[PDB]
Design goal:
This is part of a larger assembly, with chains A (206 residues), B (181 residues), C (68 residues) and D (352 residues).
Chain A: H1 14-18, H2 26-37, H3 55-64, H4 70-93, H5 107-117, E1 122-128, E2 133-139, H6 142-157, H7 167-179, H8 184-195
Antiparallel strand pairs in A: 1-2
Helix pairs in contact in A: 3-4, 4-5, 4-7, 5-7, 6-7
Chain C: H1 14-29, H2 32-46, H3 51-65
Helix pairs in contact in C: 2-3
Chain D: E1 21-24, H1 26-32, H2 39-48, E2 51-54, H3 57-67, E3 77-82, H4 88-101, E4 105-109, E5 123-124, E6 132-133, H5 135-148, H6 152-155, E7 162-163, E8 169-170, H7 176-185, H8 190-207, E9 212-217, H9 242-251, E10 258-263, H10 279-291, E11 295-299, H11 304-316, H12 328-338, H13 342-350
Parallel strand pairs in D: 3-10, 3-11, 4-9, 9-10
Antiparallel strand pairs in D: 1-2, 5-6, 7-8
Classes of the chains: A mainly alpha (206), B alpha+beta (181), C mainly alpha (68), D alpha/beta (352).
The structure holds adenosine-5'-triphosphate, guanosine-5'-diphosphate (GDP) and magnesium ion.
Guanosine-5'-diphosphate is lined by residues 127-128, 162-164, 189, 192, 195-196, 199, 242, 246 of chain D.
PDB class: ribosome
Keywords: Ribonucleoprotein complex Mitochondria Biogenesis, ribosome
Entry title: Human mitochondrial small subunit assembly intermediate (State E)
Chain lengths: 206, 181, 68, 352
């Protein structure tokens, strides 16, 4: 690393600094004073003080990226968001008066909720002890399941049975299915929670 | 605090670790009390410098163009891209990159995000005019070099507290990450 | 030949013949203006093309064609 | 609704409507614009279930010129120019809508760039063996020309006997629609049917039967270059295409009773840099000589009033779903990221 150990990662939060000195506790006051002496790394290309910044969508874009092509990854992500928004508007205009109160048209809400509906609570760990591999259950950290939701979504949308359907249209359809607790990714979550229930005795091995 | 070996040099006597700690505890106890001028000089005898300038970023001086408009110039570098920005005290948010409007120079939305970051952080969007010249590098390197130059130039027209806030956000630090051999 | 030229000569040009034909047709349907028109055309053909030159040409052509 | 205007008749718009949106009825949409509107404005129409156009200074000036047009003088060439995605195509569409409501004959070319690239079925014209025909691209235009001007095709009547083949011919005095029909049925005679139509419309309009509007978007394609090749892998010049060669005759001001309105476009252009937008840069020497004298009208980015009204229109359609977009900080961020450019603003607001 070209940064020395002294350098600390920057805090881009714009509302943090505007917090009044009166609201500062003694501990937070000490942290603020300490940070002044410290060296800070240059903020990286990416996150910004922009009010539209969404770390989850940035991570999803980074995980769709291939070969450093971030322009194409972001183009695909924005096309997916636009397709989701247009499909929801189309479904909203064709709805009855009472059905229009339960149709979500905000694409960010749909994306976050879809990625929440695919997170597995428990997982499996391959562990060979007796000369035979044993898949023991384990509860996943929050980071691990948050990563797994995105990885499963991307892998499902890259499956080759989806033939000549361009990526944005596939991804919007998968997101809208997962929004309603349907589709192959929710099935992949359920079939993991079932293979981790059919091995609840091997947990003791861990 | 004076470190053990140079304390030995000052005393011209070899001394252990524990007695060094005892001396330093006495010095701290003296510092806590309402030490006077002579006492502060005595304590200063046993303290070298590590520099407090990490606190303070250097503020550029405000210059004046022939029309009488106040402005400030600064420079930045990212990978091989090198940028020099001129920020005018009063403006309407017009950024000119190499004599071209910024949205025409930077088609990609991300670079425009990068140019937006410094002014947006201090809530001064639409309140300055920028005339920058960048050279070398690629799209993102040029965007980052411009962003650093505008941050350094904008340091002149904000409060010292906002200068520190920009420093803590990583907006005034050259990024040293470059291609390895 | 015209292709060899590095300066624009308004006299005996496509622009000159076009504007003459247009004015003859206007007279059938029914100068400083032509001087300013040729100045604008020569500027656009020789110097750099900016929006100021384009606007100057627009005003000249509007006055020639009686557009307001 | 501060962003909307109830005066939905383009003949009565003035400077007080600048920045306000007026609605185009579905009937006018399907009649006047089978092909005119930009591809990404049609998406907005389908999503919002309405086609609302903002009234801007370019279109207002171009309408004020057309209202005071003397139909005895030769047709005047108006050229809309401006930076990329600034609103020149939609200003042209505004003017086309104004002229259609006053019973003009609309000769609208949605994009002249399509006729100089990516043609699979290129033929040699039987009428003239040194020119090529584009039956797919001419038959596609003929159907929509029939749709837009269905009324006049029976009132207008040809003035010569046209021979399609030894068996089939159109006799003098027949309605023009028949010719159109002959182009729509047998695409082999599509390009020949287009030229005849032009030959009629430029001629009879002089006689005074109707007022003709020649609206050509992406006009800079006619005097440029093509990416079309022969069988010996040689380049074909634009003047060797019959469809292009016949349209250049409409641009010359050797007729009266109409106006020629044009719009430059670097989008879809061939062998032009991205940042070229000025009339000479895009037209070329030949194109500028062909159009000179012409009136160039500049289209710019949204001014603050127009930008605020556009964002208010999007909000009134509930098209900005992000919670921070309505706020003032969000509007400042949108303004900076787009720089008030209508196209960039629309694209960024699309996924918000
Ligand atoms: N008068 C207008 N009313 C409503 N929307 C407009 C108007 N002008 C521009 N826009 C918005 O800008 C987008 C792009 O505008 P337009 O299609 O007219 O581009 P253009 O200036 O012809 O550019 P290009 O060179 O890309 O063809 C339109 O889709 C619409 O979103
Ligand atoms: N198939 C066919 N096409 C015709 C006939 N007459 C005119 N056209 C077409 O309509 C256009 C009329 O425009 P014109 O001024 O005559 O151009 P020209 O080729 O130089 O003679 C021509 O380009 C032809 O393509 C005709 O008698 N038969
Ligand atoms: Mg256009």
């Amino acid at each position: 690393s070209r940064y020395s150990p002294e350098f600390k990662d920057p805090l881009i939060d714009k509302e943090y600094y505007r917090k009044p000195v009166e609201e500062l506790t003694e501990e937070e006051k000490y942290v603020r004073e300490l940070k002044k002496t410290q060296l800070i790394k240059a903020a990286p290309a990416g996150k910004t003080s922009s009010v539209f910044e969404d770390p989850v969508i940035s991570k999803f874009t980074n995980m769709m990226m291939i070969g450093g092509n971030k322009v194409l990854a972001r183009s695909l992500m924005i096309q997916t968001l636009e397709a989701v928004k247009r499909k929801q508007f189309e479904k909203y205009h064709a709805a009855s008066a009472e059905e229009q109160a339960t149709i979500e048209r905000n694409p960010y809400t749909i994306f976050h909720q879809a990625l929440k509906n695919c997170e597995p609570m428990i997982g499996l760990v391959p562990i060979l002890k007796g000369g035979r591999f044993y898949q023991v259950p384990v509860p996943l950290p929050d980071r691990r399941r948050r990563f797994l939701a995105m990885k499963w979504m991307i892998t499902e949308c890259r499956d080759k049975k989806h033939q000549r359907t361009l990526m944005p249209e596939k991804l919007s359809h998968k997101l809208l299915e997962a929004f309603h607790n349907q589709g192959p990714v929710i099935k992949r979550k359920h079939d993991l929670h079932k293979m981790a229930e059919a091995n609840r005795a091997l947990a003791h091995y861990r | 605090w004076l470190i053990k070996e140079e304390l030995e040099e000052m005393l011209v006597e070899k001394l252990s670790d524990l007695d060094y700690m005892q001396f330093i505890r006495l010095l701290e106890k003296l510092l806590t009390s309402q030490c006077g001028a002579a006492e502060e000089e005595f304590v200063q005898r046993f303290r070298r410098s590590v520099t407090l300038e990490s606190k303070k970023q250097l503020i550029e001086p405000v210059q004046y163009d022939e029309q009488g408009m106040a402005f400030s110039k600064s420079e930045g570098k990212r990978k091989t891209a090198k940028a020099e920005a001129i920020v005018y005290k009063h403006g309407s948010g017009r950024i000119k990159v190499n004599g071209i409007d910024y949205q025409l120079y930077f088609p990609i939305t991300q670079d425009r995000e990068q140019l937006m970051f410094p002014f947006h952080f201090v809530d001064r969007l639409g309140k300055h005019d920028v005339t920058c010249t960048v050279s070398g590098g690629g799209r993102s390197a040029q965007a980052g070099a411009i962003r650093l130059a505008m941050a350094k130039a904008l340091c002149s027209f904000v409060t010292e507290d906002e200068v520190e806030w920009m420093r803590q956000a990583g907006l005034l630090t050259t990024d040293p990450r470059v291609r390895e051999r | 030949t015209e292709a060899d030229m590095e300066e624009y000569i308004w006299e005996n040009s496509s622009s000159e013949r076009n504007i003459l034909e247009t004015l003859l047709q206007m007279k059938a349907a029914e100068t400083k203006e032509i001087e300013e028109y040729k100045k604008s055309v020569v500027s656009l053909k020789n110097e750099e093309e900016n929006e100021n030159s384009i606007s100057q040409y627009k005003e000249s052509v509007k006055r020639l064609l009686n557009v307001t | 609704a501060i962003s909307r205007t109830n005066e939905n008749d383009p003949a009565k718009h003035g400077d007080q409507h600048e920045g306000q949106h007026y609605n185009i009825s579905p009937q006018d949409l399907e009649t006047v614009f089978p092909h005119g509107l930009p591809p990404r404005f049609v998406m907005q129409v389908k999503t919002f279930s309405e086609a609302c156009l903002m009234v801007r200074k370019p279109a207002l000036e171009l309408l004020h010129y057309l209202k005071n047009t003397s139909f005895a003088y030769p047709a005047i060439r108006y050229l809309l120019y401006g930076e990329k995605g600034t609103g020149k195509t939609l200003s042209l569409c505004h003017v086309i809508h104004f002229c259609a409501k006053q019973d003009w004959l609309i000769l609208h070319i949605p994009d002249a760039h399509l006729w100089v690239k990516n043609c699979r079925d290129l033929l040699q014209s039987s009428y003239n063996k040194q020119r090529f025909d584009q039956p797919l691209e001419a038959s596609t235009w003929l159907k929509n020309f029939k749709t837009t001007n269905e009324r006049f095709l029976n009132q207008i009547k040809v003035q010569e006997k046209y021979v399609w083949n030894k068996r089939e011919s159109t006799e003098k005095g027949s309605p023009l629609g028949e010719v159109v029909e002959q182009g729509i049925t047998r695409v082999r005679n599509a390009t020949d049917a287009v030229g005849i139509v032009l030959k009629e419309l430029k001629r009879q309009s002089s006689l005074g039967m109707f007022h003709l509007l020649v609206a050509v978007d992406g006009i800079n394609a006619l005097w440029g270059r093509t990416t079309l090749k022969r069988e010996d892998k040689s380049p074909i010049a634009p003047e060797e295409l019959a469809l292009v060669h016949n349209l250049r005759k409409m641009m010359k001001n050797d007729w009266h009773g109409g106006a020629i309105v044009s719009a430059l476009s670097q989008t879809g252009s061939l062998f032009k840099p991205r940042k070229a937008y000025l009339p000479q840069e895009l037209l070329g020497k030949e194109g500028f000589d062909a159009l000179d004298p012409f009136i160039p009208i500049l289209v710019s980015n949204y001014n603050p009033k127009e930008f605020e009204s556009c964002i208010q229109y999007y909000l009134e359609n509930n098209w900005l779903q992000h919670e921070k977009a309505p706020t003032e900080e969000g509007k400042k961020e949108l303004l900076f990221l787009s720089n008030a450019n209508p196209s960039l603003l629309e694209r960024h607001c699309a996924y918000l």
